[PDB]
Amino acid sequence: KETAAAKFERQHMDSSTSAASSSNYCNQMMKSRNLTKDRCKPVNTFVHESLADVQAVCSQKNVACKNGQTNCYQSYSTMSITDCRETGSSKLPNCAYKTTQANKHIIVACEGNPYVPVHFDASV
């Protein structure tokens, strides 16, 4: 099946735009990345940076994970990110989301060889 690293790319990477350009960004992106097929994924974050920049975070600041594992890393720099959160009234098939653009550090869990992001934990 889809590997955790590949799923991370599909769910969290947006290297083609420097930032969310409209309030409709999330509605469109959540569908384009197949996150509303049989259920509206309630919350998601997209990172507007190159894949290389996000992958590099795995060798940046090692920080504690919520789950106690030792594989979480925080980026040294802020990155352009868009937070997407399903509205309280949203429902299939037309999932509705609130779009929020900001510049924050990201925290991801890394695994494998190559040692790359497999889960997006939070943005600070």
Side-chain angles (χ1 to χ4, degrees):
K1 72 276 297 311
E2 182 181 43
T3 67
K7 183 172 185 189
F8 176 94
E9 296 164 341
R10 174 173 62 84
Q11 293 188 149
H12 305 293
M13 294 301 308
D14 186 357
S15 305
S16 50
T17 69
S18 59
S21 294
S22 88
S23 65
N24 185 240
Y25 176 86
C26 289
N27 292 338
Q28 173 218 253
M29 283 296 285
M30 293 301 287
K31 190 183 306 75
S32 292
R33 297 307 182 82
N34 300 327
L35 309 181
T36 68
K37 66 198 302 296
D38 296 304
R39 157 182 167 279
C40 306
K41 183 154 141 59
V43 9
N44 196 57
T45 305
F46 287 104
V47 184
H48 301 275
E49 303 295 346
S50 66
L51 174 64
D53 278 10
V54 177
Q55 284 178 148
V57 176
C58 291
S59 60
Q60 288 173 26
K61 199 71 175 181
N62 183 219
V63 301
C65 293
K66 261 166 298 289
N67 64 20
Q69 292 179 207
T70 62
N71 67 328
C72 293
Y73 287 81
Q74 179 182 62
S75 63
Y76 295 145
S77 324
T78 59
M79 297 182 168
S80 168
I81 68 168
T82 302
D83 283 284
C84 294
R85 178 168 299 250
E86 189 184 10
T87 66
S89 48
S90 171
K91 258 312 303 153
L92 278 125
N94 45 314
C95 301
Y97 296 82
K98 182 63 184 180
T99 297
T100 300
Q101 176 63 221
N103 293 271
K104 300 136 79 180
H105 303 265
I106 61 174
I107 297 171
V108 300
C110 303
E111 277 175 4
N113 184 181
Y115 194 61
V116 301
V118 295
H119 189 62
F120 189 90
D121 288 0
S123 61
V124 215

